[PDB]
Enzyme design. Structure first.
Site: not given
Ligand code: HEM
Ligand SMILES: CC(C)C[C@H](NC(=O)CCCCCCCCCCCn1ccnc1)C(=O)O
Length: 454
Positions: A265, A390, A397
């Site tokens: 990611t 993010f 994020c």
């Molecule tokens: C370019 C890099 C990244 C992108 C574009 C990205 C994108 C996102 C997005 C869209 C969400 C919202 C998820 C949702 O609504 O389901 C999210 C949440 C989150 N991300 Fe990132 N992520 C990145 C890198 C990282 C990294 C490096 C970390 C940790 C070291 C991280 C940790 C988390 C965590 C823990 C959440 C959930 C936070 C919460 O709901 O309290 N992410 N991220």
């Molecule tokens: C609308 C969808 C068809 C998009 C598709 N997602 C999935 O198939 C579902 C897969 C999503 C599950 C990911 C679970 C991993 C949880 C941990 C995420 C950690 N994170 C990432 C960013 N920051 C934190 C895709 O992304 O290609």
């Protein structure tokens, strides 16, 4: 009414997701149908949003909250109630959010910087050491970098990815578990014997991950060693609201969660940024000039990384075109009307299709497919909720500053140290897993022969 893509009888729209590239598929659907469309599967419905006009409303936290898609629910089998896979209303969401937020602040990045440099130097040395007829496998090396940076900065654990051809066994298991989780999104009878092997393997992969992480935690508790890293803060920290610390089980879920995030990611951002730079040589020149002007010491300081403004514009423009966590899901907290035209009931799900939002011509103008970092010259001229790589609000994020600090450092060092050649004239092929990757992206790097600090 609401547009809806083609159907497959009683399976409704579900087979449309039975493809290697679902996000790209949904983007084409959005091009055809517009800012909103309904997507139905047996027993479920969600509405896909693509316009800033509607997404700005979806991002109103008084009206909508984070939903866990079925994908996120399957992943919860190993990510538990870590921050990413917990509902906002679960006690452990706010408790961990409060404990961890200071560890992810811009101020915290000063503390991580030295170990980020440790892994960034390993990448630069690998490339310096290639022979003239060799090439770089970009996503593979960016993933070595990002995985090792979160392991080390996070928990003082070295995956030593630059010493390896085959991934560390934990990563093999993490990747296979994630693949299984998302494979389940396409199975009529999950309890069919045909899937017995898949299940055995899944439990084995969960145990590999748990055993390592639980050991990491146990070893730290026993030594009493005060690193100053994410694990230290999780072991010591107390939520100011409840007064309680995280328990060891939840700490394990948070570590697994961070490791997933820091893998492809985050490396996807670097891989797409380099892809766009080599396809736009005038932009690569601008960015390389900034790196050479700013990074005047043998290794970069935190202060110097903060001065790489154009490098940060390049990264934001890569996040605009190919955000590597491309969709997030929301639910309606109460009955409500979206956009003055779409009545929703309490519980109704929405999907935000981020790459489409980022191509909204009413926000970005007509040239939405051009790679132009200058769109972010004044990042506060960007309208609210137009740019969301993010996520949103309190459920945005937590790693945003971490990801951008390591990406900016790394990309700056790459541009300082090497000239790059798109020697195959690479044709963009975006592989989809939980994230997006330019599959098969390769380059040659010619060293500028500038010494590194030891
Ligand atoms: C370019 C890099 C990244 C992108 C574009 C990205 C994108 C996102 C997005 C869209 C969400 C919202 C998820 C949702 O609504 O389901 C999210 C949440 C989150 N991300 Fe990132 N992520 C990145 C890198 C990282 C990294 C490096 C970390 C940790 C070291 C991280 C940790 C988390 C965590 C823990 C959440 C959930 C936070 C919460 O709901 O309290 N992410 N991220
Ligand atoms: C609308 C969808 C068809 C998009 C598709 N997602 C999935 O198939 C579902 C897969 C999503 C599950 C990911 C679970 C991993 C949880 C941990 C995420 C950690 N994170 C990432 C960013 N920051 C934190 C895709 O992304 O290609």
């Amino acid at each position: 009414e609401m547009p809806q893509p083609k159907t497959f009888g009683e399976l409704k729209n579900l087979p449309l997701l039975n493809t290697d590239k679902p996000v790209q598929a949904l983007m084409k659907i959005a091009d055809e149908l517009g800012e909103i469309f309904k997507f139905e599967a047996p027993g479920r419905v969600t509405r896909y949003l693509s316009s800033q006009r509607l997404i700005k409303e979806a991002c109103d936290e008084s009206r909508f909250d984070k939903n866990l898609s079925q994908a996120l629910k399957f992943v919860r089998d190993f990510a538990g109630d870590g921050l990413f896979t917990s509902w906002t209303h679960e006690k452990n969401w706010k408790k961990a959010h409060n404990i961890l937020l200071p560890s992810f602040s811009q101020q915290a990045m000063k503390g991580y910087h030295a170990m980020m440099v440790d892994i960034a130097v390993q990448l630069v040395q690998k490339w310096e050491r290639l022979n003239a007829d060799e090439h770089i496998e970009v996503p593979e090396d960016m993933t070595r970098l990002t995985l090792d940076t979160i392991g080390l900065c996070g928990f003082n654990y070295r995956f030593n990815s630059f010493y390896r051809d085959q991934p560390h066994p934990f990563i093999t298991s993490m990747v296979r578990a994630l693949d299984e989780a998302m494979n389940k999104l396409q199975r009529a009878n999950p309890d069919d014997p045909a899937y017995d092997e898949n299940k055995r393997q899944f439990q084995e992969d969960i145990k590999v991950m748990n055993d390592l992480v639980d050991k990491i935690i146990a070893d730290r508790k026993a030594s009493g060693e005060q690193s100053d890293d994410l694990l230290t803060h999780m072991l010591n920290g107390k939520d100011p609201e409840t007064g309680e610390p995280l328990d060891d089980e939840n700490i394990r879920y948070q570590i697994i969660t961070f490791l997933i995030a820091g893998h492809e990611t985050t490396s996807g951002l670097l891989s797409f940024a380099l892809y766009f730079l080599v396809k736009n040589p005038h932009v690569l020149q601008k960015a390389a000039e900034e790196a050479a002007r700013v990074l005047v010491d043998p290794v970069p300081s935190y202060k110097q990384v903060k001065q790489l403004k154009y490098v940060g514009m390049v990264l934001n423009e890569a996040l605009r075109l190919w955000p590597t966590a491309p969709a997030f899901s929301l639910y309606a907290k109460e009955d409500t009307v979206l956009g003055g035209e779409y009545p929703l009931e309490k519980g109704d799900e929405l999907m935000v299709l981020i790459p489409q939002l980022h191509r909204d011509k009413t926000i970005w103008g007509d040239d939405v497919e051009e790679f132009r970092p200058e769109r972010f010259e004044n990042p506060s001229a960007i309208p609210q909720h137009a740019f969301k790589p993010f996520g949103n609000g309190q459920r945005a994020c937590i790693g945003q500053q971490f990801a951008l600090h390591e990406a900016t450092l790394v990309l700056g060092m790459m541009l300082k140290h090497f000239d790059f050649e798109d020697h195959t004239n690479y044709e963009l092929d975006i592989k989809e897993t939980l994230t997006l990757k330019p599959e098969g992206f390769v380059v040659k790097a010619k060293s500028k022969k500038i010494p590194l600090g030891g």
